[PDB]
């Protein structure tokens, strides 16, 4: 499922991401744009057996378990398959675990390189939420 920017924004606000650990809603929408281009089924194999899954490209070596990654920690205690869903709950819940403090969005290189420092609010202005 590929979301529209406002539809995604609304679902994210609805799941507690607005101002979570001090991060304005714009940051989360901008991260998804650059990580999975709003696609819930985006995947991406890295040289290392690790594979990033879903709308927020969550890693299989540390956060979810795809059962094919050598030395998985599975810190979100979830199978990587669930992160590939139209419903973003599982993805949001794991992202919440990952962002433990006000610098935790650095967990997404795309956000650090393409969103941080820019007008991330632009992604939500004109959206109904």
């Amino acid at each position: 499922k590929v979301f529209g920017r406002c539809e995604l924004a609304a679902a994210m606000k609805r799941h507690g991401l607005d101002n979570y650990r001090g991060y304005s809603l714009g940051n989360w929408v901008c991260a998804a744009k650059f990580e999975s281009n709003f696609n819930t089924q985006a995947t991406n194999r890295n040289t290392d057996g690790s594979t990033d899954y879903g709308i927020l490209q969550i890693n299989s070596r540390w956060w979810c378990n795809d059962g094919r990654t050598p030395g998985s920690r599975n810190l979100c205690n979830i199978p990587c398959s669930a992160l590939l869903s139209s419903d973003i709950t599982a993805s949001v819940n794991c992202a919440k675990k990952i962002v433990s403090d006000g610098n935790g969005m650095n967990a997404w290189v795309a956000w650090r390189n393409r969103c941080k420092g820019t007008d991330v609010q632009a992604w939500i202005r004109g959206c109904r939420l």
Epitope: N19, G22, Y23, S24, N27, R112, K116, G117, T118, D119, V120, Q121, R125
Partner: antibody, heavy 116, light 107 residues
Framework: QVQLQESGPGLVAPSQSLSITCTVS????????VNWVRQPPGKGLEWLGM???????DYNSALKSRLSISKDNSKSQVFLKMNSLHTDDTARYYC??????????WGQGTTLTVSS | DIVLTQSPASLSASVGETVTITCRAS??????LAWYQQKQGKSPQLLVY???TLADGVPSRFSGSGSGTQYSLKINSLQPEDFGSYYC?????????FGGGTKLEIK
Amino acid sequence: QVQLQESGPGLVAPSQSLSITCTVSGFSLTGYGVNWVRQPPGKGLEWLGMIWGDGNTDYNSALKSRLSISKDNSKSQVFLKMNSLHTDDTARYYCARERDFRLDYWGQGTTLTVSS
Amino acid sequence: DIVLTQSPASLSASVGETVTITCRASGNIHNYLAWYQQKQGKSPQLLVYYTTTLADGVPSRFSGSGSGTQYSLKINSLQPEDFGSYYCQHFWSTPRTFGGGTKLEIK
């Protein structure tokens, strides 16, 4: 730790242009915006404009045409240039760091007086 | 531009009192509102961002509220170090503007 400091000319005539510098340390100019704000003697705060981490700029509507903001990421400096100086421009000028829609760290400010 | 109407211009109070400062926006700012405190001869300092969030190190006696167009800063049990000026500022698009300020002084 995060620090911002302004430097400016102090006194300027209308026939002169104005440049104030904001040197920062403790963070990268690519990851944060820097806003310019002024406070005339005994008055309230006035927003002048800003420069995003990406280099884009936005200005105060009424002053846009007299203002120019630029930065040098390598020198860790941001500049505010003003022309067509009025006496109403006399004020304390500040640069502040913007982190995700809030000015979290401010410089001490520099005082400017617009003479005859 | 979205203009902010802050009131009152001045307020006299005693230590221990609870006061309220208000900021009304000419248009919906969607909670993108911050409050600063400025002490005599110092730079403004951040207190509250995104309407209700306290900056680090700010005591819980300060609390923010609001939605849409009306916003308030409540100070519970004023302390000697709370006196000075207070400003609200919005961050909805650009240009940004500040409220006119409120001088909080000793009764």
